[PDB]
């Protein structure tokens, strides 16, 4: 997260870290057994880390649980990033408490100008690289689809939206992929892609979760 702020330990209790001997992507806990992340975050050997603040120190409140299923959307296109969503089933149910909690799925899509919370352990620099120990947070509005398409002509599908700023300085970045965009207590977005990070006129692009609520439901119920 570039241009954000330290969230505070366990203030985003649905935020998870996906770990393969290092933090590689974020995700969101949606019930005791299931995590939503990005399809492009798929790999073998995923350990889900819940209740994290400092990802480099065992502080208390962590739960490390292996992924038992990693389900990429069958129509995920790695060329266009359309359908950039993945479901991870945990080996054992997480213990839910104040510091480890699920986030609600949307009942409807969000509108332009809705203010959302984007969070992660990604790069904090727009130029070069700095990775934080603790979780970072950013408040960011959903942009109009006209403005989103103007920024990225021919590249924004019905399953994507833009959020953030056009003036530069505030954005999600490398290492934040798969993590949450939460608006009015609903998981509306998944950190997906963009042109660089926090660059003028290049807002972040996010998977539009409201389009997948039925798929998520049908997939969990059958697994």
């Amino acid at each position: 997260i570039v241009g954000g702020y330290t969230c505070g330990a366990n203030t985003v209790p649905y935020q998870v870290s996906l770990n393969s001997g290092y933090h590689f992507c974020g995700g969101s806990l949606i019930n005791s057994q299931w995590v939503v992340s990005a399809a492009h975050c798929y790999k073998s050997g995923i350990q889900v880390r819940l209740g994290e603040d400092n990802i480099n120190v065992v502080e208390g409140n962590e739960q490390f649980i292996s992924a038992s299923k990693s389900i990429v959307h069958p129509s995920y296109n790695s060329n266009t990033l359309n359908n950039d969503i993945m479901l991870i089933k945990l080996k054992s149910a997480a213990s839910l408490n104040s510091r480890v909690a699920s986030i609600s799925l949307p009942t409807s899509c969000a509108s332009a100008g809705t203010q959302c919370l984007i969070s992660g352990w990604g790069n904090t620099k727009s130029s070069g690289t700095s990775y934080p120990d603790v979780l970072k947070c950013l408040k960011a509005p959903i942009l109009s689809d006209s403005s989103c398409k103007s920024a990225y002509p021919g590249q924004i599908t019905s399953n994507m939206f833009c959020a953030g700023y056009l003036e530069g300085g505030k954005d999600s970045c490398q290492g934040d992929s798969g993590g949450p965009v939460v608006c009015s207590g609903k998981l509306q977005g998944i950190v997906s892609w963009g042109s660089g990070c926090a660059q003028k006129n290049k807002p972040g692009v996010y998977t539009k979760v409201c389009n997948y609520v039925s798929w998520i439901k049908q997939t969990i119920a059958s697994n």
Partner: peptide
């Protein structure tokens, strides 16, 4: 344009 992962660029 890149994904925001440990990046996949185009």
């Amino acid at each position: 344009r890149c994904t925001k992962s440990x990046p996949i660029c185009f």
